[PDB]
Amino acid sequence: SMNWDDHAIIIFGYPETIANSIILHFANFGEILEDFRVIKDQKYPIYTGDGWVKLTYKSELSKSRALQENGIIMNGTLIGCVSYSPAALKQLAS
Amino acid sequence: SMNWDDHAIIIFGYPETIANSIILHFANFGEILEDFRVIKDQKYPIYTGDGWVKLTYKSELSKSRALQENGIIMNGTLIGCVSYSPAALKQLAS
């Protein structure tokens, strides 16, 4: 029961049609602790809403790499990637 | 030695209905080259689309301040702000 929030990111800005593709893309940077069904091959429940998702990596090395993806284009749309903070999550619409 | 694009940003991720509120927010960091209608007042080209806009600052210091807004929440939505690159524009669904 420790806190891995510093290993977490929020990905945002995408249409929900590419939500699964988003998870697969960011799974390429490390092992994700949430049990997302598309990658099914202490618990980390899923925080997600329309156009955003929180993901937690096992390694901080992975989080730092994922952050470099802020502003990539997937299916013609700009994808946002920021470091997780509770302050941001509290404000998000679902 | 320089293009103005060295002072440009792309802002993205917002509902297109609040596009002009986004522009106002970022125009507050400094004078920009584009003549958007919401900003008070040949001409410089304008690049915008659904949920994104390019802004070019006169001052690199204004761009630097704008970049710090990456990841703020507006209207329950995360806002991305990245340095403009011509690579991204070509792949955007304009």
Coordinates of C-alpha atoms in Angstrom, one line a residue:
Chain A
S1 CA 0.0 0.0 0.0
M2 CA 2.4 2.7 -1.3
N3 CA 1.7 5.7 -3.5
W4 CA 2.7 5.4 -7.2
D5 CA 1.1 8.7 -8.3
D6 CA 4.6 10.0 -9.4
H7 CA 4.6 7.0 -11.9
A8 CA 1.3 8.2 -13.4
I9 CA 0.3 10.2 -16.4
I10 CA -3.0 11.6 -17.8
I11 CA -3.4 11.2 -21.5
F12 CA -6.1 13.4 -23.1
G13 CA -7.6 15.1 -26.0
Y14 CA -8.6 12.2 -28.2
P15 CA -12.0 11.0 -29.5
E16 CA -13.2 7.9 -27.7
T17 CA -13.0 5.9 -30.9
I18 CA -9.2 5.7 -30.4
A19 CA -9.3 5.1 -26.6
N20 CA -8.0 1.5 -26.9
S21 CA -5.4 2.6 -29.4
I22 CA -4.2 5.2 -26.9
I23 CA -3.6 2.5 -24.3
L24 CA -1.8 0.3 -26.7
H25 CA 0.4 3.2 -27.8
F26 CA 1.4 4.0 -24.2
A27 CA 1.9 0.4 -23.3
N28 CA 4.9 0.5 -25.6
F29 CA 6.8 2.5 -23.1
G30 CA 6.5 0.2 -20.1
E31 CA 4.4 -2.0 -17.9
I32 CA 1.0 -0.4 -17.0
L33 CA -0.4 -1.3 -13.5
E34 CA -4.1 -0.7 -14.3
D35 CA -5.9 -3.8 -15.6
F36 CA -7.1 -2.4 -18.9
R37 CA -8.9 -5.1 -20.9
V38 CA -7.1 -4.3 -24.2
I39 CA -3.7 -5.1 -22.7
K40 CA -5.0 -8.2 -20.7
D41 CA -2.8 -10.2 -23.0
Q42 CA -2.4 -3.6 -4.5
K43 CA -5.1 -2.6 -7.0
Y44 CA -5.0 0.4 -9.3
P45 CA -8.6 1.3 -10.2
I46 CA -9.3 2.9 -13.5
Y47 CA -9.8 6.7 -13.7
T48 CA -11.1 7.6 -17.2
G49 CA -13.6 9.7 -18.9
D50 CA -14.5 10.9 -22.4
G51 CA -11.3 11.8 -24.0
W52 CA -8.9 11.1 -21.1
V53 CA -7.3 8.3 -19.1
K54 CA -4.9 8.0 -16.1
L55 CA -2.2 5.4 -16.5
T56 CA 0.4 4.3 -14.0
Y57 CA 3.7 2.7 -15.0
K58 CA 5.8 0.3 -12.9
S59 CA 8.9 2.3 -13.8
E60 CA 9.6 6.1 -13.6
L61 CA 11.8 5.6 -16.6
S62 CA 8.6 4.8 -18.6
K63 CA 6.7 7.8 -17.3
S64 CA 9.5 10.1 -18.4
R65 CA 9.5 8.6 -21.9
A66 CA 5.7 8.8 -22.1
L67 CA 5.7 12.5 -21.4
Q68 CA 7.7 13.1 -24.6
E69 CA 4.6 12.0 -26.4
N70 CA 2.8 15.3 -25.6
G71 CA 1.6 16.7 -28.9
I72 CA 1.9 13.5 -31.1
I73 CA -0.8 13.0 -33.7
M74 CA -2.9 9.8 -33.7
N75 CA -5.6 9.4 -36.3
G76 CA -5.3 13.1 -37.2
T77 CA -5.7 14.4 -33.7
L78 CA -3.2 16.0 -31.3
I79 CA -2.7 13.8 -28.2
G80 CA -1.9 15.4 -24.8
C81 CA 0.2 13.6 -22.1
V82 CA 0.9 15.3 -18.8
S83 CA 2.2 14.2 -15.4
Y84 CA -0.6 13.0 -13.1
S85 CA -1.7 15.3 -10.3
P86 CA -4.7 15.0 -8.0
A87 CA -5.4 18.7 -8.6
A88 CA -6.0 18.0 -12.3
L89 CA -7.9 14.8 -11.8
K90 CA -10.3 16.4 -9.3
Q91 CA -11.3 19.0 -12.0
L92 CA -11.9 16.6 -14.9
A93 CA -15.4 16.1 -16.3
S94 CA -16.2 12.5 -17.0
Chain B
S1 CA 18.6 32.7 -39.2
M2 CA 15.0 32.6 -38.0
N3 CA 11.4 32.0 -38.9
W4 CA 8.6 33.4 -36.7
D5 CA 7.7 29.8 -36.1
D6 CA 10.3 29.7 -33.5
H7 CA 7.9 31.8 -31.4
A8 CA 4.8 29.7 -32.3
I9 CA 2.7 27.3 -30.2
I10 CA -0.1 24.9 -30.8
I11 CA -2.9 24.8 -28.2
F12 CA -5.2 21.8 -28.3
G13 CA -7.7 19.6 -26.6
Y14 CA -10.5 22.0 -25.8
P15 CA -14.1 21.8 -27.1
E16 CA -14.2 23.8 -30.2
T17 CA -17.1 25.8 -28.7
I18 CA -14.6 27.6 -26.4
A19 CA -11.9 28.2 -29.0
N20 CA -12.2 32.0 -28.7
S21 CA -11.9 31.9 -24.9
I22 CA -8.8 29.8 -25.4
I23 CA -7.3 32.4 -27.7
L24 CA -8.1 35.2 -25.3
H25 CA -6.5 33.4 -22.5
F26 CA -3.2 32.9 -24.4
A27 CA -3.2 36.3 -26.1
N28 CA -3.0 37.6 -22.6
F29 CA 0.7 36.5 -22.5
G30 CA 1.8 38.7 -25.3
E31 CA 1.2 40.2 -28.8
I32 CA 0.6 37.6 -31.5
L33 CA 1.0 37.9 -35.3
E34 CA -2.2 36.3 -36.4
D35 CA -5.3 38.5 -36.8
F36 CA -7.9 36.5 -35.0
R37 CA -11.3 38.2 -34.7
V38 CA -11.5 37.8 -30.9
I39 CA -8.3 39.8 -30.4
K40 CA -9.0 43.5 -30.3
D41 CA -7.8 45.8 -33.0
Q42 CA -0.4 41.2 -46.6
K43 CA -1.4 39.6 -43.3
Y44 CA 0.1 36.6 -41.5
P45 CA -1.4 33.2 -42.3
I46 CA -3.9 31.5 -39.8
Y47 CA -3.9 27.8 -39.0
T48 CA -6.7 26.5 -36.8
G49 CA -9.0 23.5 -36.8
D50 CA -11.4 21.6 -34.6
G51 CA -10.0 21.7 -31.1
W52 CA -6.6 23.2 -32.0
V53 CA -5.0 26.5 -33.0
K54 CA -1.5 27.8 -33.8
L55 CA -0.5 31.2 -32.2
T56 CA 2.7 33.0 -33.1
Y57 CA 4.1 35.4 -30.5
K58 CA 6.2 38.5 -31.2
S59 CA 8.3 37.7 -28.1
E60 CA 10.0 34.4 -27.3
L61 CA 9.4 35.2 -23.6
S62 CA 5.6 35.3 -24.3
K63 CA 5.9 31.8 -25.9
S64 CA 7.8 30.6 -22.9
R65 CA 5.1 31.8 -20.5
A66 CA 2.4 30.2 -22.7
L67 CA 4.2 26.9 -22.6
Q68 CA 3.8 26.8 -18.8
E69 CA 0.1 26.6 -19.3
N70 CA 0.4 23.0 -20.7
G71 CA -1.9 20.8 -18.7
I72 CA -4.2 23.5 -17.1
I73 CA -7.9 22.6 -16.9
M74 CA -10.5 24.8 -18.6
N75 CA -14.2 23.8 -18.5
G76 CA -13.4 20.4 -17.1
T77 CA -11.0 19.7 -19.9
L78 CA -7.2 19.4 -20.0
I79 CA -5.4 21.9 -22.4
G80 CA -2.3 20.9 -24.2
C81 CA 0.3 23.6 -25.2
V82 CA 3.3 22.6 -27.3
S83 CA 6.0 24.3 -29.3
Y84 CA 4.9 24.5 -33.0
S85 CA 6.7 22.2 -35.4
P86 CA 5.9 22.0 -39.1
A87 CA 5.9 18.2 -38.8
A88 CA 2.7 18.3 -36.6
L89 CA 0.8 20.7 -38.8
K90 CA 1.1 18.5 -41.9
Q91 CA -0.5 15.5 -40.0
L92 CA -3.3 17.4 -38.4
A93 CA -6.8 16.9 -39.8
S94 CA -7.1 20.6 -40.8

